[PDB]
Amino acid sequence: MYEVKEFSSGKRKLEDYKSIIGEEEVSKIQEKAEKLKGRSFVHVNSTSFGGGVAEILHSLVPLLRSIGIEARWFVIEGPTEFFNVTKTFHNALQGNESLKLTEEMKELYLNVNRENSKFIDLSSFDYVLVHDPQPAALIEFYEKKSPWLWRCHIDLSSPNREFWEFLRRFVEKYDRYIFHLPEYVQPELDRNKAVIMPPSIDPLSEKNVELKQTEILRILERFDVDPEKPIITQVSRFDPWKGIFDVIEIYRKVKEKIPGVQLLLVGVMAHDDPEGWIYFEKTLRKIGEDYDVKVLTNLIGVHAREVNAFQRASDVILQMSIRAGFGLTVTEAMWKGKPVIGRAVGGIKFQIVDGETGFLVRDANEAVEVVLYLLKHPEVSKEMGAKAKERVRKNFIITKHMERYLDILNSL
Numbered sequence: 576m577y578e579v580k581e582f583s584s585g586k587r588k589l590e591d592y593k594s595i596i597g598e599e600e601v602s603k604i605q606e607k608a609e610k611l612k613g614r615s616f617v618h619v620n621s622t623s624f625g626g627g628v629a630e631i632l633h634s635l636v637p638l639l640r641s642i643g644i645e646a647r648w649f650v651i652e653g654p655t656e657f658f659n660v661t662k663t664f665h666n667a668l669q670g671n672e673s674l675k676l677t678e679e680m681k682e683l684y685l686n687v688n689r690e691n692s693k694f695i696d697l698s699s700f701d702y703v704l705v706h707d708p709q710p711a712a713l714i715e716f717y718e719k720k721s722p723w724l725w726r727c728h729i730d731l732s733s734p735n736r737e738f739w740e741f742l743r744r745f746v747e748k749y750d751r752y753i754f755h756l757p758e759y760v761q762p763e764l765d766r767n768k769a770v771i772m773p774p775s776i777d778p779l780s781e782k783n784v785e786l787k788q789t790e791i792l793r794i795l796e797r798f799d800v801d802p803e804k805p806i807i808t809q810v811s812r813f814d815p816w817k818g819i820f821d822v823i824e825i826y827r828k829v830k831e832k833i834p835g836v837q838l839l840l841v842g843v844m845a846h847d848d849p850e851g852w853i854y855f856e857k858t859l860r861k862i863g864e865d866y867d868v869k870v871l872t873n874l875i876g877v878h879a880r881e882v883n884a885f886q887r888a889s890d891v892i893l894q895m896s897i898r899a900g901f902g903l904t905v906t907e908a909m910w911k912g913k914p915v916i917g918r919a920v921g922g923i924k925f926q927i928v929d930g931e932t933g934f935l936v937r938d939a940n941e942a943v944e945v946v947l948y949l950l951k952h953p954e955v956s957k958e959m960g961a962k963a964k965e966r967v968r969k970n971f972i973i974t975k976h977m978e979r980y981l982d983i984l985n986s987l
């Protein structure tokens with residue numbers, strides 16, 4: 576078990592967001608964190624590098640720090656055979672009821688959880704929070720003297736039975752379980768000690784920070800994207816159920832009346848995600864030699880900062896997911912003042928206030944209508960964008976995410 580101590584984001588302090596949230600909120604926040612001043616609020620997970628969760632802590636911990644709470648962050652160490660197993664666990668918990676949980680696995684998972692719990696005495700802190708499955712078992716290697724919270728960053732609606740019944744022996748021990756959406760809360764758990772806490776975006780990160788026109792134009796020209804013509808964009812993982820092919824049809828029907836329209840299919844995926852690269856290849860084969868369609872991925876040099884650009888340069892952003900999680904992508908777009916058009920699923924039906932911040936449609940033809948409408952009425956589009964930004968500012972910001980943590984600690 577290791578400890579971060581440093582923070583990439585730097586010294587993320589509430590003050591760094593004052594301009595973004597206003598002083599009434601910066602106060603409302605400071606007030607709620609005084610009643611917990613000097614407390615111990617530690618976090619435990621699997622890494623401080625590869626992961627959005629890690630990126631969240633790098634800003635969330637400093638923040639808690641700078642507001643009177645002695646927040647601290649510990650990580651778990653381990654051999655490949657542990658993460659490969661936890662990878663199986665991860666996929667098993669999210670469907671894929673074709674994986675087998677063997678004893679060799681349980682031994683390794685639990686053991687690794689044993690050795691890592693002898694480096695730091697988590698039970699000595701006022702509040703303990705554990706992130707995802709990898710360290711969920713730490714709770715039975717100490718004598719609780721304070722509340723322990725279980726933060727889940729994945730779906731648990733249709734979990735491989737075998738695997739859930741195992742992880743459940745540890746989860747049920749925590750005082751509270753935290754899920755992104757009220758569809759991830761497995762019934763085997765007491766819905767009174769369950770908590771809905773949507774993920775959040777950080778206004779000051781590479782992905783969301785506001786770039787300067789010159790840079791946006793440098794990234795645009797680099798990927799042969801004409802900013803002087805209209806642009807529609809869908810940011811997402813390349814898999815069979817994200818509407819990627821529907822989007823391609825919306826771009827084509829739209830393109831009959833607006834022959835200059837461009838489509839940006841943006842997606843960052845890990846190189847050990849064969850599934851996603853196959854679907855990627857399939858998309859290119861489907862698009863053919865129509866270069867008004869831009870397939871932009873990290874294979875070609877696209878990362879957080881380029882994604883930022885692509886979203887800012889978009890006139891309309893889509894999310895025709897058939898099956899979706901919370902949809903932080905819709906959150907980022909909304910925060911950038913863009914009207915979103917997407918199916919009503921997962922976090923997409925929650926974030927979009929149809930007809931106000933964006934539109935919830937049922938198919939591609941309904942999608943085509945609204946894209947033309949929006950593109951036709953840039954003022955209506957400016958309006959929908961402005962209100963969608965506010966919804967984010969008042970509901971899904973990292974500072975609002977933290978304030979949610981206070982509310983929970985103030986209720987123990």
Ligand SMILES: O=c1ccn([C@@H]2O[C@H](COP(=O)(O)OP(=O)(O)O[C@H]3O[C@H](CO)[C@@H](O)[C@H](O)[C@H]3O)[C@@H](O)[C@H]2O)c(=O)[nH]1
Pocket residue numbers: 627728729730776782810811812841842843844878879882899900901902903904907
């Ligand atoms: O091509 C991409 C796709 C995503 N992002 C970033 O990732 C976030 C969006 O993630 P979403 O695209 O919101 O992630 P999910 O597809 O919802 O992740 C799935 O897989 C997760 C576990 O890995 C589960 O917890 C989720 O519920 C499940 O929906 C955004 O903030 C982006 O910054 C990119 O930069 N490029």
